[PDB]
Design a protein around this ligand. Structure first.
Ligand SMILES: NC(=O)C1=CN([C@@H]2O[C@H](COP(=O)(O)OP(=O)(O)OC[C@H]3O[C@@H](n4cnc5c(N)ncnc54)[C@H](OP(=O)(O)O)[C@@H]3O)[C@@H](O)[C@H]2O)C=CC1
Ligand SMILES: Nc1nc2ncc(CNc3ccc(C(=O)N[C@@H](CCC(=O)O)C(=O)O)c(O)c3)nc2c(=O)[nH]1
Length: 159
């Protein structure tokens, strides 16, 4: 089972300027709950974007995709291909835009947070993959974050 997990603005934006363009602590706790105890796979940029305090993310086997054969990330397994990254039975792909797109065909679950923030797409943003009609989804109820932003959770699956 390969799953993808991400949070997006309604527009599809997931990243800008090498970071995530909003604050939503409740969603980050959700991320931890889903991923804890599993292998997680991410692109090198997403690894770079993790706060030092949680790089690597604790309690998870951190796998990082890079085309730099020499790249080393403390506490992570650097691999050069998606094939080498997807060897664990349950794997969560945690981004970013490039790696979500790469892994989408391999995935049978998506755990998606929609963030109700006005954030029109800009050139060079990182974007969420678009889920087509092969996916079946359940839509959760809107909640307000302590940050003031409304958000909701989707669970998608395809067999
Ligand atoms: N809101 C959310 O849920 C999330 C948001 N983000 C945001 O996403 C953005 C980063 O996404 P993005 O810029 O797309 O970069 P990624 O995180 O997807 O990392 C891309 C890097 O992965 C490596 N890579 C890509 N394709 C391959 C391949 N086929 N084989 C081997 N290595 C490969 C390269 O590393 P190298 O260059 O070292 O070769 C490439 O530069 C940031 O802004 C981050 O904050 C990230 C995760 C979740
Ligand atoms: N839905 C959803 N998916 C994501 N998938 C990938 C990334 C990449 N960026 C991340 C991922 C995790 C953290 C992080 O600090 N996580 C900690 C703290 C958890 C907590 O605060 O309770 C942990 O998991 O232990 C981060 O600072 C950036 N983000 C999200 C995201 O924000 N939302």
């Amino acid at each position: 089972m390969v799953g993808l997990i991400w949070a997006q603005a309604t527009s599809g934006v997931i990243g800008r300027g090498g970071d995530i363009p909003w604050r939503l602590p409740e969603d980050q706790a959700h991320f931890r709950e889903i991923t804890m105890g599993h292998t997680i796979v991410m692109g090198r940029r997403t690894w770079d974007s993790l706060p030092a305090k949680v790089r690597p993310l604790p309690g998870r086997r951190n796998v990082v995709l890079s085309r730099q054969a020499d790249f080393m990330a403390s506490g992570a397994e650097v691999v050069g291909s998606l094939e080498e990254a997807l060897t664990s039975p349950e794997t969560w792909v945690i981004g970013g835009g490039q790696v979500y797109a790469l892994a989408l065909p391999y995935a049978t679950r998506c755990e998606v947070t929609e963030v109700d923030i006005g954030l029109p797409r800009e050139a060079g943003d990182a974007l969420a993959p678009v889920l087509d009609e092969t996916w079946r989804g359940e839509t959760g109820e809107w909640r307000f974050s302590r940050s003031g932003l409304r958000y909701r959770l989707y669970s998608y699956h395809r067999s």
